Amino acid sequence: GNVNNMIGKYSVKGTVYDPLNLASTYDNNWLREAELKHGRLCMLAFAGFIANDAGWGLPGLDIKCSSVEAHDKMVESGHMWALLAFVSVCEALHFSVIIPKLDGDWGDYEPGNYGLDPFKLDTPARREAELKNGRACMLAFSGIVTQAALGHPAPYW
Amino acid sequence: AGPMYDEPLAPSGMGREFINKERAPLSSYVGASQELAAFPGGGGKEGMAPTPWDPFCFSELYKVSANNPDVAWLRESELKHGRMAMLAITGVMVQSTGFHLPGNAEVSFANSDWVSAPTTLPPVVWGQVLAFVAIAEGQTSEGLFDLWLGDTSKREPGNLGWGSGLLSKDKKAADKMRLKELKNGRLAMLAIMGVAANHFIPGALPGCIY
Amino acid sequence: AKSQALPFLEKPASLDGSMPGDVGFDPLGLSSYFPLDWMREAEIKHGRVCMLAIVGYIAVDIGIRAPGAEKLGSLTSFTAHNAAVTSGHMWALLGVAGIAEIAGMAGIAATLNGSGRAPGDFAFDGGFAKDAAKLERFKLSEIKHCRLAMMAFSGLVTQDAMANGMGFPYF
Amino acid sequence: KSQALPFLEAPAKLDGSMAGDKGFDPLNLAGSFDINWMREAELKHGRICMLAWVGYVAVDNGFYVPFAPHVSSLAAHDTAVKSGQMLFLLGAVGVVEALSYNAINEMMSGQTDRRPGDFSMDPFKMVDTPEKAKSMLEKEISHCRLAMMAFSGVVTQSALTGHGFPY
Amino acid sequence: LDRSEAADTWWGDKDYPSSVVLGIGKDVPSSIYGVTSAIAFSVGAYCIAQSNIINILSGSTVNGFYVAGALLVPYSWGLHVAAWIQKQNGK
Numbered sequence: 001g002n003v004n005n006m007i008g009k010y011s012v013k014g015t016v017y018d019p020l021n022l023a024s025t026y027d028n029n030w031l032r033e034a035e036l037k038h039g040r041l042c043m044l045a046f047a048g049f050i051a052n053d054a055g056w057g058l059p060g061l062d063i064k065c066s067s068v069e070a071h072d073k074m075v076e077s078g079h080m081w082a083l084l085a086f087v088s089v090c091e092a093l094h095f096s097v098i099i100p101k102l103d104g105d106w107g108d109y110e111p112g113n114y115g116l117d118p119f120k121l122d123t124p125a126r127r128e129a130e131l132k133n134g135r136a137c138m139l140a141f142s143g144i145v146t147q148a149a150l151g152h153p154a155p156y157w
Numbered sequence: 158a159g160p161m162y163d164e165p166l167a168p169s170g171m172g173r174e175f176i177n178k179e180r181a182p183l184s185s186y187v188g189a190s191q192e193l194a195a196f197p198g199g200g201g202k203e204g205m206a207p208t209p210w211d212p213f214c215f216s217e218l219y220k221v222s223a224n225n226p227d228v229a230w231l232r233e234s235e236l237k238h239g240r241m242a243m244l245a246i247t248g249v250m251v252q253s254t255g256f257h258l259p260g261n262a263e264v265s266f267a268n269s270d271w272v273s274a275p276t277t278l279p280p281v282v283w284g285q286v287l288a289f290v291a292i293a294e295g296q297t298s299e300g301l302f303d304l305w306l307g308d309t310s311k312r313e314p315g316n317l318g319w320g321s322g323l324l325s326k327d328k329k330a331a332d333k334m335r336l337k338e339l340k341n342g343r344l345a346m347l348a349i350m351g352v353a354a355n356h357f358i359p360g361a362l363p364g365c366i367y
Numbered sequence: 368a369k370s371q372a373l374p375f376l377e378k379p380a381s382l383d384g385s386m387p388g389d390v391g392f393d394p395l396g397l398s399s400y401f402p403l404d405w406m407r408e409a410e411i412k413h414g415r416v417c418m419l420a421i422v423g424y425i426a427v428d429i430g431i432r433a434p435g436a437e438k439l440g441s442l443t444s445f446t447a448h449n450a451a452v453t454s455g456h457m458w459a460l461l462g463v464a465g466i467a468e469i470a471g472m473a474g475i476a477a478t479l480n481g482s483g484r485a486p487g488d489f490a491f492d493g494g495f496a497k498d499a500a501k502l503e504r505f506k507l508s509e510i511k512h513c514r515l516a517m518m519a520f521s522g523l524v525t526q527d528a529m530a531n532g533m534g535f536p537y538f
Numbered sequence: 539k540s541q542a543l544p545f546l547e548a549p550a551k552l553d554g555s556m557a558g559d560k561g562f563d564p565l566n567l568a569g570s571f572d573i574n575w576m577r578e579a580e581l582k583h584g585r586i587c588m589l590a591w592v593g594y595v596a597v598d599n600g601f602y603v604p605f606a607p608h609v610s611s612l613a614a615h616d617t618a619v620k621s622g623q624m625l626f627l628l629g630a631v632g633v634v635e636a637l638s639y640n641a642i643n644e645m646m647s648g649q650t651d652r653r654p655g656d657f658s659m660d661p662f663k664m665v666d667t668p669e670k671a672k673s674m675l676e677k678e679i680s681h682c683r684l685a686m687m688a689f690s691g692v693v694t695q696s697a698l699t700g701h702g703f704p705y
Numbered sequence: 706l707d708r709s710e711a712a713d714t715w716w717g718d719k720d721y722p723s724s725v726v727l728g729i730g731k732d733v734p735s736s737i738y739g740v741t742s743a744i745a746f747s748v749g750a751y752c753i754a755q756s757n758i759i760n761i762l763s764g765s766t767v768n769g770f771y772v773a774g775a776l777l778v779p780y781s782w783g784l785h786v787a788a789w790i791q792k793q794n795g796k
């Protein structure tokens with residue numbers, strides 16, 4: 001694809017933000033798919049960091065730990081292995097669907113259109129909101145992890 | 158009466174015309190590397206050089222005799238070594254971190270010495286691995302004598318049929334993925350043999366950690 | 368076109384709705400690799416084994432004992448395997464299983480060679496082959512029950528293993 | 539279609555031509571190798587098992603020869619070996635078995651129209667005509683199979699537990 | 706045996722030999738050949754291992770049923786060659 005025809009340009013000024021001209025280096029559809037996946041994974045990570053530090057808990061875990069050290073405790077316990085199995089199944093399906101179309105025709109598969117729209121909530125404004133929230137979440141989660149890892153409590157400051 | 162300078166010693170009506178027919182060239186194989194042709198002036202693009210690398214001309218040694226293998230066989234062996242070396246280098250890298258399977262009273266998978274890692278296991282545990290490799294390498298190999306003499310018809314070099322459907326339909330992208338395979342395989346071959354050489358004689362690989 | 372269970376994923380080539388219970392569910396594409404008749408025969412065999420296994424497990428956990436099997440002792444379903452193999456009755460079970468499996472080899476070889484025998488058709492029906500549509504519906508129900516029962520026995524035996532010697536509920 | 543296994547058809551070689559043909563060959567052994575050798579082997583096994591069963595039963599229900607050791611049929615083999623009569627019977631059966639080497643060779647090569655398991659023993663012309671031959675051959679092969687299974691059960695029960703004619 | 710009493714078994718032109726070379730086993734299916742080959746090789750390896758390796762072979766006590774079965778390894782070799790021959794013959 002071509003980045004100039006995609007959704008997600010600068011909102012108020014309307015210009016494409018590619019100062020380093022990296023759009024031409026790689027397949028633009030792959031860039032869109034990776035951007036959406038990174039943004040979505042980071043929204044989930046941001047919400048999970050905040051929820052774990054809040055202490056919501058999960059049906060069935062007794063372990064109560066801070067999110068900065070929850071990784072080691074949960075991989076020792078074994079929950080992270082089940083989560084990795086689930087993610088591996090889903091991302092192996094995504095492997096099978098996208099990697100056969102890396103540097104070739106992508107067909108009818110729009111980047112990020114998995115078809116999980118049972119409630120019929122699709123809108124171009126909502127796609128733009130998805131991209132902007134994903135970018136904000138990428139930056140916010142970067143900040144939240146590097147602030148918590150330095151020992152700053154839950155508000156993160 | 159063929160590409161070879163000499164008629165094959167195999168007789169007429171029992172193989173001679175089968176060996177002495179036209180064979181595909183090295184240029185029609187996805188192995189060119191831009192890194193070798195990475196200098197001012199002449200050079201390639203998309204990770205591939207305009208021409209393949211063969212200083213010793215082992216690819217076209219068939220013209221002297223049919224004792225020597227064909228480029229189809231050489232590509233089959235290259236991809237086999239690359240795949241095996243990729244699995245091997247990944248295995249040693251993962252094992253050296255200390256990560257190991259749970260184990261029980263009978264089996265203990267706790268050993269960081271990759272050289273002596275198989276020796277610690279019981280006879281059955283590595284026996285199953287060797288038996289699986291023996292059966293598969295031997296069942297998947299049908300028509301390899303045909304790739305030696307050159308008949309890339311029944312068997313394509315490196316196409317075992319495992320996950321071949323995930324290759325892209327576009328020729329350019331399929332060749333790109335095949336070239337990525339070849340490059341990673343060659344890098345893994347160099348890496349695993351370098352680690353082995355470093356183990357046998359220290360200092361062979363100065364950047365070693367194993 | 369696209370898989371019914373995985374519309375985002377392209378449909379498998381081998382699966383085409385011919386077999387009962389076909390939804391086009393095969394991300395790994397092992398049907399394209401190895402024959403589909405063998406796969407469906409294995410699926411039905413696994414389902415039959417597991418769905419008998421569930422009934423046997425729950426029965427012998429509840430306390431239903433075979434005639435003369437009470438002599439083995441205070442045996443739950445969890446620990447009955449070891450005692451049975453030591454006592455030697457499980458060897459007789461292996462013998463009977465091999466007797467049935469000889470006909471199993473004959474059937475699978477026949478349907479692979481081209482006899483036309485359906486996968487799992489052992490001609491042991493209880494007079495329910497009067498109508499082809501009824502047979503097709505029963506085959507679909509059988510395969511659905513097989514798919515349910517493999518997972519059901521998986522969960523049952525793990526839960527029992529996690530709880531060690533435990534009775535019927537496992538809750 | 540095979541009658542024993544009604545979910546598949548019988549092989550090409552099981553065609554009724556032979557006695558006791560129920561269309562039972564799940565492994566295609568008789569399609570893999572000559573069926574005359576199979577039938578001759580089946581007959582030989584069955585005759586040996588018939589005679590073995592009746593001899594075991596009689597020796598357990600007291601039936602011994604003059605100048606014989608009064609012993610159960612389980613240890614009769616060892617005691618007869620020690621006496622030496624076992625080797626005399628071995629030679630007696632070996633003569634017939636070498637003649638059976640010749641007979642099997644002629645049967646398989648087609649030099650003679652010999653039926654498997656046939657040594658031309660018909661004092662009373664019990665099967666001089668085709669229909670009598672079919673009937674009596676079906677009845678024998680049935681007795682062969684039944685006595686084979688029966689003697690396997692008997693000897694084993696005897697070697698496992700107990701003794702006597704019942705077991 | 707006379708020179709005339711011999712089937713034409715030469716197969717230099719062909720890619721695979723005819724099933725006549727198997728003799729009595731010419732009609733044996735390839736699947737049966739292969740599975741019997743696997744069983745024979747496993748049993749023979751087990752017998753040799755239990756005769757010589759797992760128990761060091763003592764002259765006073767040798768089982769005999771392990772000496773038998775050790776011959777099945779050559780038999781397994783022949784059986785898998787015949788399996789390949791029948792597979793290429795389509796028989």
Ligand code: CLA
Pocket residue numbers: 763764765766767768769770772773776
């Ligand atoms: C009839 C001939 C004969 C006799 C009387 C003996 C007697 C003896 N041998 Mg044996 N031996 C023989 C033939 C014979 N051997 C042959 C042909 C070989 C193969 C080369 C050997 C190889 C051998 C070894 C290596 C050793 C003995 C030893 C012994 C002693 C104990 C064996 C035992 O208990 O076996 C009991 C076994 C049985 C009752 C059943 C045997 C049935 C066989 C396996 C049938 C098949 C034979 C086969 C086809 C022939 C070819 C050989 C093949 C295995 C390669 C004893 C003094 C041991 C000894 O004295 O050590 C100090 C010892 O270490 N023998």
Ligand SMILES: CC(=O)O[C@H]1CC(C)(C)C(=C=C/C(C)=C/C=C/C(C)=C/C=C/C=C(C)/C=C/C=C(\C)C(=O)C[C@@]23O[C@]2(C)C[C@@H](O)CC3(C)C)[C@](C)(O)C1
Pocket residue numbers: 243244246247250319320321341342344345348349351352364365366367395396397
């Ligand atoms: C089943 C079915 O139907 O489909 C399946 C089947 C099919 C087709 C097989 C599939 C696939 C593909 C697979 C499985 C691909 C796997 C690829 C893999 C696993 C590739 C490893 C590469 C490793 C390299 C290059 C290592 C370099 C190593 C280098 C450069 C080093 O120097 C290492 C190093 O230690 C030294 C030497 C020195 C030290 O100082 C330390 C370091 C670290 C620097 C799919 C997608 O699953 C689909």
Ligand code: KC2
Pocket residue numbers: 433434435436437438439456
């Ligand atoms: C698969 C399940 C199953 C079935 C369907 C089944 C059916 C029948 C029928 C027909 C309806 C009869 C008539 C019958 C009779 C006897 N069964 Mg039996 N039985 C099954 C399982 C077991 C087990 C596990 C044992 C066993 C035994 C005995 C004994 C004791 C003999 C003794 O001890 O003298 C006798 C008399 C025990 C045994 O033999 O132990 C040595 C023993 O442990 N059965 N059994």
Ligand SMILES: CC1=C(C#C/C(C)=C/C=C/C(C)=C/C=C/C=C(C)/C=C/C=C(C)/C=C/[C@@]23O[C@]2(C)C[C@@H](O)CC3(C)C)C(C)(C)C[C@H](O)C1
Pocket residue numbers: 077078079081082388390510511512514515518
């Ligand atoms: C789809 C379909 C059908 C179906 C179906 C059905 C009903 C399917 C049901 C599936 C279902 C219900 C599947 C459960 C899996 C559970 C797993 C893998 C649990 C892992 C559990 C793990 C890894 C747990 C690990 C630990 O607890 C351990 C061991 C101890 C501690 O360390 C703690 C942790 C947590 C680390 C039809 C309708 C029948 C037919 C149709 O045609 C097709």
Ligand SMILES: CCCCCCCCCCCCO[C@H]1O[C@H](CO)[C@@H](O[C@H]2O[C@H](CO)[C@@H](O)[C@H](O)[C@H]2O)[C@H](O)[C@H]1O
Pocket residue numbers: 091092093095096097098100101320321322323375376377378379393394395396
């Ligand atoms: C652990 C790290 C290793 C990698 C783990 C993940 C492995 C994932 C592999 C998925 C299985 C790949 O193999 C299987 O993929 C697809 C399943 O419909 C099939 O491929 C089919 O679907 C793809 C996606 O719709 C299309 O792009 C292909 O053109 C089409 O042929 C392949 O023909 C089949 O071979």
